[PDB]
Amino acid sequence: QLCEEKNLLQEKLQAETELYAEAEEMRVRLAAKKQELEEILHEMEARIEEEEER
Amino acid sequence: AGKLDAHLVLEQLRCNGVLEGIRICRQGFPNRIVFQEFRQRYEILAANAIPKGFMDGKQACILMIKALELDPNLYRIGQSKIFFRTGVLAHLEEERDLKITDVIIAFQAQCRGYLARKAFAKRQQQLESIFCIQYNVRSFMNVKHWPWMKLFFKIKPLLKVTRQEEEMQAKDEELQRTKERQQKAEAELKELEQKHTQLCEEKNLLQEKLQAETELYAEAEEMRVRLAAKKQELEEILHEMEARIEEEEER
Amino acid sequence: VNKALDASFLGILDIAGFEIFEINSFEQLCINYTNEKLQQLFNHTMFILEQEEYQREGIEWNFIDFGLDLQPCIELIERPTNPPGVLALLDEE
Amino acid sequence: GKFIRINFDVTGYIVGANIETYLLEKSRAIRQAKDERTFHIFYYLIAGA
Amino acid sequence: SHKGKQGPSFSYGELEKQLLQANPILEAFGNAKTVKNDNSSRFGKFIRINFDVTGYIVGANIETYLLEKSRAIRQAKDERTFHIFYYLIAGASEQMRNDLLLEGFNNYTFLSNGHVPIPAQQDDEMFQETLEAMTIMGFTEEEQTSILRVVSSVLQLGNIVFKKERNTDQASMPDNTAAQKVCHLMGINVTDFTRSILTPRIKVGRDVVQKAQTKEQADFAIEALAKAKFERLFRWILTRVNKALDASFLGILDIAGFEIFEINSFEQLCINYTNEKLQQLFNH
Amino acid sequence: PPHIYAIADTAYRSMLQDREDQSILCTGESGAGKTENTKKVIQYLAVVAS
Amino acid sequence: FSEEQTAEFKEAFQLFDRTGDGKILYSQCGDVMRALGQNPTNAEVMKVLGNPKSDEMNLKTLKFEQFLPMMQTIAKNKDQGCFEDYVEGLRVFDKEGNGTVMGAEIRHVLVTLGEKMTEEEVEQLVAGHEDSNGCINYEELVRMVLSG
């Protein structure tokens, strides 16, 4: 466990800033994905509504 | 609904006998009770109306009617039972229920009492027993960090144990093997401990170094993780929504 | 139903209510019959019976005629031999 | 008509229940008057089927 | 059989010890003073002793019969109830005295002729004798105290009154104390008892015919109740006794003897019946 | 205040009090609600006495 | 209250504080009075508490010196229950003069009349006095809580 922790710490040191940057990037990607998903969902909903009407 | 026809409802009250159905409730005596149950239920109201000796149910209860100075228009004495007027018996009941309220309630109390003195005198048992427990722990917290006590600890086992074991020829051999194994294990443990200590020291140093860049990095990492989790959740929600929308559209 | 649902008992009575449409068939006859029947029960237990016991126990009481009886309208459809009832005739006939 | 009977023990609890049914106007099962219907269940079935 | 090894002077076996102390027990709840015998056997009895092949006693049964428990409620002129009653009202210890609500004599109505004495016999001691017996027999220390309250009970239930009610005509319980006590000894409850005792929440045939009896009925029950609550005792002890006393058997038959007083009730009929029965056996 | 649940309890007790079976008879012309009021009486007794 | 007992009362009062200020929450008063062999009804306790309110009944505290004056005030009262009547009331639930009541009916009354108890309270009480048929003998249960 200690070794693992040490490794993580070392990476961060190379580290906290680097980690933060990575996290930020990940967050951005996630946000983009979420947005895309939302758009898709909306489209699907619209289609479903149309189908129901038909 | 909300509409109410006067005459339609006027007739119903006519062919159903409502009014008359009420006259007798006011006119007659819709409540009756037999001489025994009466001198039974409401005697508690007139404890001294009926003499210590026996007496004819009727007469004996007519006494307690004077004892309540009941108006001669509320009641009507009969042959075996008394015929009362509406409400007259209700009030009689109320009173009696008052005359005994306190007493009721009464028992419940003693129960909380009993039920109490006992469950308290219980926490009392876990107590010297507590102290024992109390102090006893404290020791350890102090001791467990003491050289001498750790020593006793590693050592406490070697105690009893031998010569016979060693001799045994098979037993002796086994014992020797066990001892060797134990020694090896101990050595390994010591090495591991040393390594762990070194690792801990290194980790501490690393942490200090990080605290500023390292600290920032850690924070960033945490934020990123949180963001990722949020994104995942959002994606899942979106998917669900899409599915729902599709279903709705089909419908 | 009664196979699952099964000293004291509570009785709840839901009879069909006086109904009178266009075609007043047989059904409507027994239905409005029972309705007339039941009512009379209330009349009995409410005025008739109550005053009898006042007499029995012998309390200071004088009778009161609430004028509420439908026995007649029951005989016209209930009674058998002797002046037959609506049901009677339609039975043998 | 319907007369439900509920049965209680000595402690005052419900334990049983009978039901005496009466004049079932099953006539209407074949022909219903103007603006009237048959026994619910019928329609229920023709639809909830 | 002996564990190896002057008048009654002799140490008997372990069971023969009991076989001996049994009869002095049934004699308590079962015998009573009558115009023909100060200590009459109020029930036929047929004792059976069992022997092995070597000829030794090993077991013993007791078949009890017509227990005239009627008299437990009302005793004829110059007669008494079942000994045990008087024994208790007297041999009762101060403490246990109240413990079963054992008021003195003539405070109970089941004892006609109030407290009548028995010649050459002292009920006072009589108690211990039987108390002593019960122990010899086997009845647990408390196992007895109980068999005693149940006695007082069978007596208190006699105080319980039911005075007519010219209003409703269904006598009531003008006094609690009576059944108040009684219901305590029974380990039951008042209110319930009372209703049940006055208003039978019965259930005839296919109906929960709830009704209320008349003063009389109110007693014929509270009476024939205690009266049978008694018999429930005799038959019980008898199987407690018979629980210890238990190829060959010896039979000893003690039936009740031809008796014929003033009121020749049913009892006297079956009794003088058996007597006629048995005789004919001898004739055959 | 007057309510159906009241008639139901008044009877259900009266029964257990003077030990004497009882009946709740709903009169009224067709439509007047003879039924509903019955469903309640059971509804109540189904919880109050169960 | 002889100092002899008053001296001990303290031992009891003191034996009632989870933390340590030496205060008995306005609530505890009841049990502490009970523990001291007192059977004050729920009202007899509030009356000598100035009839506080639930909330403040869990905030307000007590010190022996201010508590003692109450211990006595209660101690000296006008009445008390007794087999005599106590059981006379339960015997009213004795379905059929058996002398015993169903541990369920007893369990009811006790938690639906007067100073309503709790489901657990009654449980802990009757628990172990119901027979095979879950039948309790009041006469005894009475004495139990009593002589106990």
Per residue, the 3-state secondary structure of chain B, as one string, reads CCCCCHHHHHHHHHHCCHHHHHHHHHHCCCEEEEHHHHHHHCCCCCCCCCCCCCCCHHHHHHHHHHCCCCCCCCCCECCCEEEECCCHHHHHHHHHHHHCCCCCCHHHHHHHHHHHHHHHHHHHHHCCHHHHHHHHHHHHHHHCCCHHHHHHHHHCCCCCCCHHHHHCCHHHHHHHHHHHHHHHHHHHHHHHHHHHHHHHHHHHHHHHHHHHHHHHHHHHHHHHHHHHHHHHHHHHHHHHHHHHHHHHHHC
Q: Which of E167, E173, E174 sits opposite B80 (nearest CB)?
A: E167
E209's CB contacts (< 8 A; 6+ apart) are E202, E203
For chain C, the C-alpha Rg in angstroms (whole number) is: 18
Same domain, G84 and G68: no
Are the beta carbons of G104 and G92 closer than 8 angstroms?
Answer: no
The separation between the first and the last C-alpha atoms of chain F, rounded to the nearest angstrom, is 24
Q: What is the DSSP string of G30-86?
A: HHHHHHTT----HHHHHGGGT---GGGGTT----HHHHHHHHHHHHS-S----HHHH
Same domain, G93 and G138: yes
Q: Residue G146 belongs to a domain with what CATH number?
A: 1.10.238.10
Same domain, G34 and G87: no
B85's CB contacts (< 8 A; 6+ apart) are B29, B31, B73, B74, B75
The conformational region for residue E224 under phi > 0 = left, psi -120 to 50 = alpha, else beta, is alpha
Which token pair is B216? 């920032």
DSSP state of E188: B
Same domain, G73 and G110: no
Question: What is the dihedral sign for C-alpha B90, B91, B95, B98?
Answer: positive
Instruction: Examine chains C and F and say if they touch (3+ CB pairs below 8 A).
Output: yes
Query: What is the distance between the alpha carbons of residues A47 and A41, in angstroms, rounded to a whole number?
Result: 10
Q: Which of C10, C16, C21 sits opposite D23 (nearest CB)?
A: C16
What's the gap between Cα C89 and its chain centre?
21
Closest by CA position to B250, among listed A52, E61, A5 = A52
Q: What residues of chain E lie within 8 A of the CB of G92, using their CB? A: 189-192
Classify residue B108 as exposed, middle or buried by CB count within 10 Å of its CB (0-12, 13-18, 19+): buried
Chain C residue at shortest CA distance from F15 = C8
Same domain, G41 and G68: yes
Q: What residues of chain B lie within 8 A of the CB of E165, using their CB? A: 34-36, 57-58, 80
Same domain, G105 and G32: no
Query: What is the distance between the alpha carbons of residues C7 and C13, in angstroms, rounded to a whole number?
Result: 20
Q: Which of G81, G117, G148 sits opposite B106 (nearest CB)?
A: G81
Closest by CA position to B76, among listed C60, E169, C50 = C60
Query: What is the distance between the alpha carbons of residues E165 and E171, in angstroms, rounded to a whole number?
Result: 5
Query: What is the distance between the alpha carbons of residues B65 and B215, in angstroms, rounded to a whole number?
Result: 94
Closest by CA position to E91, among listed E115, E67, E122 = E122
Same domain, G107 and G62: no
Identify the helix (H) or strand (E) that includes residue G135: strand G135-136
Closest by CA position to E67, among listed E252, E241, E232 = E232
Q: b vs e for G5-32, b when ≥16 Cβ sit within 10 Å of the residue's Cβ?
A: eeeebeebbeebeeeeeebbebbbbbbb
Question: Considering G37, G56, G79, which residue would you say is the last residue of a domain?
Answer: G79
The size of chain G, in residues, is 148
Same domain, G49 and G9: yes
Are the beta carbons of E21 and E137 closer than 8 angstroms?
Answer: yes
Asked if E201 reaches chain F (Cβ–Cβ under 8 Å), the answer is yes
Query: What is the distance between the alpha carbons of residues E75 and E32, in angstroms, rounded to a whole number?
Result: 10
Which residues from D are below 8 Å from G when comparing CB atoms?
A: 10-11
E69's CB contacts (< 8 A; 6+ apart) are E227, E228, E230, E231, E234
Which residues from B are below 8 Å from G when comparing CB atoms?
A: 101-121, 124
Distances (CA, A) of B10 to B5, B14, F32: 8, 6, 14
* Cβ atoms within 10 Å of B71's Cβ, excluding its own: 9
Cross-chain residue pair B238–A20, CB shorter than 8 Å: no
Mutate to test the interface with F, among C14, C20, C44 (most CBs of F within 10 A): C14
Same domain, G17 and G53: yes
Which token pair is G104? 């369920």
* Cβ atoms within 10 Å of C14's Cβ, excluding its own: 20
Place of tokens 């079962």: E30
Helix (H, G, I), strand (E, B) or coil at C91: helix
Min Cα distance E195 → chain F (Å) is 10
- Which spans in E100-200 are helix H? 123-137, 141-156, 177-185, 190-198
Query: What is the distance between the alpha carbons of residues C11 and F26, in angstroms, rounded to a whole number?
Result: 11
Query: What is the distance between the alpha carbons of residues B194 and B196, in angstroms, rounded to a whole number?
Result: 5
Same domain, G74 and G2: yes
- Strands of the sheet with C8-14, listed across from one edge: D14-21, D2-8, C8-14, F22-25
Asked if E211 reaches chain C (Cβ–Cβ under 8 Å), the answer is no
Are the beta carbons of E173 and E162 closer than 8 angstroms?
Answer: yes
Q: Which domain holds residue G99?
A: 80-148
Helix (H, G, I), strand (E, B) or coil at E50: strand
Closest by CA position to G116, among listed B111, B119, B117 = B111
Are the beta carbons of B242 and A48 closer than 8 angstroms?
Answer: no
Question: Considering G24, G57, G79, which residue would you say is the last residue of a domain?
Answer: G79
Query: What is the distance between the alpha carbons of residues E109 and E104, in angstroms, rounded to a whole number?
Result: 12
Same domain, G70 and G17: yes
Q: What residues of chain B lie within 8 A of the CB of C59, using their CB? A: 29, 76-78, 83
Place of tokens 């048959």: D38
- Count up the domains in chain G and report the number: 2
CA atoms within 13 A on the CB side of E231: 16
Which token pair is B17? 């006998």
Distances (CA, A) of G105 to B105, B249, C9, E201, G134: 16, 59, 20, 19, 10
Query: What is the distance between the alpha carbons of residues G102 and G90, in angstroms, rounded to a whole number?
Result: 11
Give break positions in chain A: residue before each, C–N beyond 2.5 Å: 14
Query: What is the distance between the alpha carbons of residues E238 and E63, in angstroms, rounded to a whole number?
Result: 9
Main-chain dihedrals φ then ψ at residue G99, nearest 5 degrees: 105, 0
Question: Considering G47, G79, G111, which residue would you say is the last residue of a domain?
Answer: G79
Same domain, G71 and G96: no
Q: Which of F21, F28, F41 sits opposite C8 (nearest CB)?
A: F21
Tell me the β-bridge partners of F23: C11
